[PDB]
Design an enzyme around this catalytic site. Structure first.
Site, PDB file in Angstrom:
ATOM      1  N   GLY A  13       0.801  -1.246   0.000  1.00  0.00           N
ATOM      2  CA  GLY A  13       0.000   0.000   0.000  1.00  0.00           C
ATOM      3  C   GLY A  13       0.828   1.287   0.000  1.00  0.00           C
ATOM      4  N   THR A  14       0.172   2.407   0.336  1.00  0.00           N
ATOM      5  CA  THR A  14       0.860   3.684   0.668  1.00  0.00           C
ATOM      6  C   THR A  14       2.040   3.545   1.666  1.00  0.00           C
ATOM      7  OG1 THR A  14      -1.121   4.102   2.059  1.00  0.00           O
ATOM      8  CG2 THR A  14      -0.782   5.546   0.155  1.00  0.00           C
ATOM      9  N   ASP A 127      -5.378  10.493  -2.962  1.00  0.00           N
ATOM     10  CA  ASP A 127      -4.776   9.390  -3.698  1.00  0.00           C
ATOM     11  C   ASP A 127      -5.826   8.514  -4.345  1.00  0.00           C
ATOM     12  OD1 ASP A 127      -2.465   8.119  -4.684  1.00  0.00           O
ATOM     13  OD2 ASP A 127      -2.434   6.693  -3.036  1.00  0.00           O
ATOM     14  N   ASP A 145      -7.496   3.052   1.176  1.00  0.00           N
ATOM     15  CA  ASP A 145      -6.208   3.670   1.391  1.00  0.00           C
ATOM     16  C   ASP A 145      -6.202   5.169   1.755  1.00  0.00           C
ATOM     17  OD1 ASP A 145      -3.610   4.284   1.606  1.00  0.00           O
ATOM     18  OD2 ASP A 145      -2.951   2.874   0.004  1.00  0.00           O
TER      19      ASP A 145
HETATM   20  C1  LIG Z   1      -2.538  -2.886  -2.647  1.00  0.00           C
HETATM   21  C2  LIG Z   1      -3.241  -2.187  -1.496  1.00  0.00           C
HETATM   22  C3  LIG Z   1      -4.694  -1.904  -1.836  1.00  0.00           C
HETATM   23  C4  LIG Z   1      -5.307  -1.057  -0.710  1.00  0.00           C
HETATM   24  O1  LIG Z   1      -5.736   0.110  -1.391  1.00  0.00           O
HETATM   25  N1  LIG Z   1      -5.418  -3.114  -2.247  1.00  0.00           N
HETATM   26  C5  LIG Z   1      -6.344  -3.772  -1.533  1.00  0.00           C
HETATM   27  N2  LIG Z   1      -7.038  -4.722  -2.183  1.00  0.00           N
HETATM   28  C6  LIG Z   1      -8.016  -5.391  -1.572  1.00  0.00           C
HETATM   29  N3  LIG Z   1      -8.793  -6.286  -2.226  1.00  0.00           N
HETATM   30  C7  LIG Z   1      -8.784  -6.411  -3.646  1.00  0.00           C
HETATM   31  C8  LIG Z   1      -7.892  -7.577  -3.902  1.00  0.00           C
HETATM   32  C9  LIG Z   1      -8.296  -8.801  -3.390  1.00  0.00           C
HETATM   33  C10 LIG Z   1      -7.513  -9.925  -3.587  1.00  0.00           C
HETATM   34  C11 LIG Z   1      -6.319  -9.816  -4.283  1.00  0.00           C
HETATM   35  O2  LIG Z   1      -5.555 -10.928  -4.445  1.00  0.00           O
HETATM   36  C12 LIG Z   1      -5.903  -8.570  -4.806  1.00  0.00           C
HETATM   37  C13 LIG Z   1      -6.707  -7.441  -4.615  1.00  0.00           C
HETATM   38  C14 LIG Z   1      -8.284  -5.124  -0.250  1.00  0.00           C
HETATM   39  N4  LIG Z   1      -9.310  -5.836   0.397  1.00  0.00           N
HETATM   40  O3  LIG Z   1      -9.956  -5.220   1.242  1.00  0.00           O
HETATM   41  C15 LIG Z   1      -7.536  -4.168   0.415  1.00  0.00           C
HETATM   42  N5  LIG Z   1      -7.823  -3.861   1.697  1.00  0.00           N
HETATM   43  C16 LIG Z   1      -7.335  -2.639   2.322  1.00  0.00           C
HETATM   44  C17 LIG Z   1      -8.516  -1.954   2.975  1.00  0.00           C
HETATM   45  C18 LIG Z   1      -6.232  -2.900   3.324  1.00  0.00           C
HETATM   46  N6  LIG Z   1      -6.569  -3.518  -0.237  1.00  0.00           N
END
Ligand SMILES: CC[C@H](CO)Nc1nc(NCc2ccc(O)cc2)c(N=O)c(NC(C)C)n1
Ligand code: NA
Ligand code: NA
EC number: 2.7.11.22
Lengths: 290, 256
Positions: A13-14, A127, A145
């Site tokens: 992430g960030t 962002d 994020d």
């Molecule tokens: C890479 C970081 C981002 C956060 O903006 N991606 C992400 N993707 C998330 N999910 C989409 C995703 C799910 C499975 C994967 O293998 C890849 C992306 C996700 N789930 O809540 C999540 N949670 C944050 C709130 C910590 N964060």
């Protein structure tokens, strides 16, 4: 942390690392944001302090839910709800056939509700990009994020200049205005709106100057008439080429009159006249949203 | 404009929730209002030495009072609490927060880096990371929009008065930030221009001059008696031309 089993690495992430995880006692699926504290030796990072404090003030269906914060001597974990997909990945999987228009409208409407709420509670996200927008199987989309976020004042002071990922960054930032505010978030959503419709980034710059010129080529190089004060701005250069504004039916061909009108208002050059999240929700484009 | 009203509404709601327990100092065995005043006045100087914003100082004081509302602290640890609070507030609020080693340095090595960082963890735990608190300053900057064009002397004097209120737990802990700000702004407006708490702000805030009167009575006294207060860092700060020397102006003798 004994009770969480890591399922897969979601990404970086960030700051720090994100994992999909399962609560071994309850079955509950979460996303864990890990921050290693010993590798900074400056305490808890501001990014984390702000994300946590501001998320506890932001309870809304279109804002990602922070569930718990677990604070070891050695590590810090934010425990969030898990959503199965991000918008960047969803756009890639819909790259040929397109995301259907009603789903694009629905997602934009939800993003705006989430963002109006942020702005109503004096928070700038700073962002917004498809990677940070999370979708569940129920059809909901959520802002995520908040590590680059900040609580703002009325009126604003000067804030950090290095903000927003380049492709989604507003012209007032690029040109170095002393003040910026909620409008920078609207710009980002405007870029995302157009990207959903055309299936590619609206302004994919590889430098600050290249980014500006791509904006100029599409929207017209701004002058004193359209944006008072622009030619006096710190990083404005009189040598900037003067391009004419492109007709919005080449920029976003699939969109009706209402769609084009809303996008143009979201990408208005003068941040004072750029539409608010609140007024955007009352735009005719949304009269048939589902 | 859209959401300016909403922000105000929202801050009015959070200032009730981020309020400390009014009588907490009675329940502290080893520390007093007087030691609190010394600590806050020292934080003013730290803010000056590192050119930190006034908002940062106001947030630090909020954090300290909240922490001391639920935790017993010995006098020789009170400065450690204040240091960690100022560090946290800097991280929240500043573009360039000072580094921890600089904070250790202004304590004159009273504490170690390790102690400051462990206290940072403990303050975060006790406040449950709720750092986005309303302050007197956040209400002031909004109130200032209702004087056009801005009178920079009024603004500096209002800020000065709001800053002095941080020093004395008795009586200012019993007022909400929005009320202290209102008193501060009326008092500053009156001292410099002869004007009063404007009609537009009666509409925005719901406060009349009469609802402001008790806080305004206290703040008038604090202002009159400022040159003889044991703590003087704020008065010294507001002598500078950056603040239009407003601490040197004569307080009005009556308010009518
Ligand atoms: C890479 C970081 C981002 C956060 O903006 N991606 C992400 N993707 C998330 N999910 C989409 C995703 C799910 C499975 C994967 O293998 C890849 C992306 C996700 N789930 O809540 C999540 N949670 C944050 C709130 C910590 N964060
Ligand atoms: Na324009
Ligand atoms: Na006591």
């Amino acid at each position: 942390m004994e009770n969480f089993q890591k399922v897969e690495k979601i990404g970086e992430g960030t700051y720090g690392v994100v994992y999909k995880a399962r609560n071994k006692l309850t079955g509950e699926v979460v996303a864990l944001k890990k921050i290693r504290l010993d590798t900074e030796t400056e305490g808890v990072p501001s990014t984390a302090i702000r994300e946590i404090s501001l998320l506890k003030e932001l309870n809304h269906p279109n804002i990602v839910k922070l569930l718990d914060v677990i604070h070891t001597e050695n590590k810090l974990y934010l425990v969030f709800e898990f959503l199965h997909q991000d918008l960047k990945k969803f756009m890639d999987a819909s790259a040929l056939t397109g995301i259907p228009l009603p789903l694009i409208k629905s997602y934009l409407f939800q993003l705006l509700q989430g963002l109006a709420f942020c702005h109503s509670h004096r928070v700038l996200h700073r962002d917004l990009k498809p990677q940070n927008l999370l979708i569940n199987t129920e059809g909901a989309i959520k802002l995520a994020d908040f590590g680059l976020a900040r609580a703002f004042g009325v009126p604003v002071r000067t804030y950090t200049h290095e903000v927003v990922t380049l492709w989604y960054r507003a012209p007032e930032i690029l040109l170095g205005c002393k003040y910026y505010s909620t409008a920078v978030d609207i710009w980002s959503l405007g870029c995302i709106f157009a990207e959903m419709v055309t299936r590619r980034a609206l302004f994919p710059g590889d430098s600050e100057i290249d980014q500006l010129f791509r904006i100029f080529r599409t929207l017209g190089t701004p002058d004193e008439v359209v944006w008072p004060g622009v030619t006096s701005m710190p990083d404005y250069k009189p040598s900037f080429p003067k391009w004419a504004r492109q007709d919005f039916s080449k920029v976003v061909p699939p969109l009706d009159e209402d769609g084009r009108s809303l996008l143009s208002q979201m990408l208005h050059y003068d941040p004072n006249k750029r539409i608010s999240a609140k007024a955007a929700l009352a735009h005719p484009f949304f009269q048939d949203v589902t | 404009p859209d959401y300016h009203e909403d922000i105000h509404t929202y801050l009015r709601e959070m200032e009730v929730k981020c309020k400390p327990k009014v009588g907490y100092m009675k329940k502290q065995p080893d520390i007093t209002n007087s030691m609190r005043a010394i600590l806050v006045d020292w934080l003013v100087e730290v803010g000056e030495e590192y050119k930190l914003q006034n908002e940062t100082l106001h947030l630090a004081v909020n954090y300290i009072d909240r922490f001391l509302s639920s935790m017993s602290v010995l006098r020789g640890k009170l400065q450690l609490v204040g240091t960690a609070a100022m560090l946290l507030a800097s991280k929240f609020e500043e573009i360039y927060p000072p580094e921890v080693a600089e904070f250790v340095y202004i304590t004159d090595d009273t504490y170690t880096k390790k102690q400051v960082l462990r206290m940072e963890h403990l303050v975060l735990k006790v406040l449950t990371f709720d750092l986005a608190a309303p302050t007197v300053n956040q209400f002031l900057t909004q109130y200032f929009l209702h004087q056009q064009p801005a009178n920079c002397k009024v603004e500096s004097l209002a800020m000065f008065l709001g800053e002095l209120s941080l020093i004395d737990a008795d009586p200012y802990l019993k007022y909400l930030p929005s009320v202290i700000a209102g008193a501060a702004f009326h008092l500053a407006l009156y001292t410099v221009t002869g004007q009063s708490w404007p009609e537009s702000l009666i509409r925005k805030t719901g406060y009349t001059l009469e609802s402001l009167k008790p806080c305004l009575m206290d703040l008038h006294q604090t202002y009159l008696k400022a040159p003889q207060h044991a703590q003087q860092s704020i008065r010294e700060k507001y002598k500078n031309s950056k603040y239009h020397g407003v601490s040197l102006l004569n307080p009005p003798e009556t308010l009518n």
